[PDB]
Amino acid sequence: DPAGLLDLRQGMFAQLVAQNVLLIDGPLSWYSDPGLAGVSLTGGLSYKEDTKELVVAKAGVYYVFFQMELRRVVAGEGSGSVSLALHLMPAAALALTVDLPPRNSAFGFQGRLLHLSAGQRLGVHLHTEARARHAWQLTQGATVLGLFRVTPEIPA
Amino acid sequence: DPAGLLDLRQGMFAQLVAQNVLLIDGPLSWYSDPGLAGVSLTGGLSYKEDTKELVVAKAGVYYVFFQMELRRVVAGEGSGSVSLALHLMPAAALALTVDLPPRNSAFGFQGRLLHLSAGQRLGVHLHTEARARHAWQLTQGATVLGLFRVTPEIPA
Amino acid sequence: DPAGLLDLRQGMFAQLVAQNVLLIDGPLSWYSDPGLAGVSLTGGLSYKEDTKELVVAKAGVYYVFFQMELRRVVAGEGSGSVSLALHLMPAAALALTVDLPPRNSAFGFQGRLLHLSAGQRLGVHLHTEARARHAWQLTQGATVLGLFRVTPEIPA
């Protein structure tokens, strides 16, 4: 199973940083950075090993957010939009679109409450087009997926 | 006074579990489970003693949520909706409705910020109809009322 | 630099209490009260020294809220609305309006997620009109500006 495991108790928080910098269509690759607050990814992944798939171990409602920072690396060029979408695997649960000015930075954040069943597999896909992809990149280390568990277990 | 007391400091959290399993119209009965995170109910109630009335001791804004899980216990039967509504005692402050498929589970969550005055009495009423009530039940221990205090006292 | 400094780590919280009681148009004056939860204002301000300007040291998304409590001090008089608006210095990021009955109390709360860049200067302006200003006041110590940092730094 290539996925990392997120096992959160109520009131506990985890965040994942995207390895990607190029705006390439498809699943982002995530890792846990122990220098950041929160619980680490589990299920057999090594220290800072990145994965495109995540499994949420506990059923619950989670506040889930995306943050994305972009920057224009090719002077005088690029425009369009860049989107992220969280997909339940195997419509988007949570989506974030950020517009790029033809300022040389762009930023977006979006979160929401999501119900996630035990064992729920998750992926995040990025989409943009050629004009943006050829001139802009993700700022390194600033694309983050956050999860906060709101709800409890059933009493023993 | 039959009510349990919720005395929360800023930044502190309490949750109550519903004793009910039958979908009967009227006030739900709540207790604090010490095996769950958060502050316990106070004001003279015994260990896991349930109550239909709650009094919030401190004036403030609280994030308040309901969670409800239901399950079809009579094979091949039941449909409709089930509602919860928080009432200020003695319009609903917070309401949650969940639709039941004619899957054998249903789930809902709703929260919101509420201003609650010192001493504010609270009850939660459940409503549904015969068809749902005769075939579905609350999953045991998964109906929860959560309160999180956002705001502070006046400085001394 | 007359501003107080807010230097918050991820997951950390700070709140400021307004010194003002009169409903006078213009910037409110804020101080940190160590008797309240959260991180203190920094940047050279003394113990409970109040300031009209705040600088947020770390770039991030913050949940920011205003709370305001008002009370009718002149019996049988006053009506209108009172507004607060957070301004990025040097449209309003966050705004709260509270209506005053011609009950002798009024209350409002509003919060929202805001993206704040490193070094972002902030002020809060109050507005009302003569009729309200001549009969109502801010309850002392109950006007609060809260900030909670949601997002992380870039990994080292």
From Swiss-Prot, chains A, B, C:
This is Tumor necrosis factor ligand superfamily member 9. Residues 1-156 are extracellular. The gene is TNFSF9. It comes from the Eukaryota. GO terms for molecular function: cytokine activity; signaling receptor binding; tumor necrosis factor receptor binding; tumor necrosis factor receptor superfamily binding. One of its GO terms (biological process) is immune response. The keyword Zinc does not apply. Expressed in brain, placenta, lung, skeletal muscle and kidney. It is found in: Membrane.
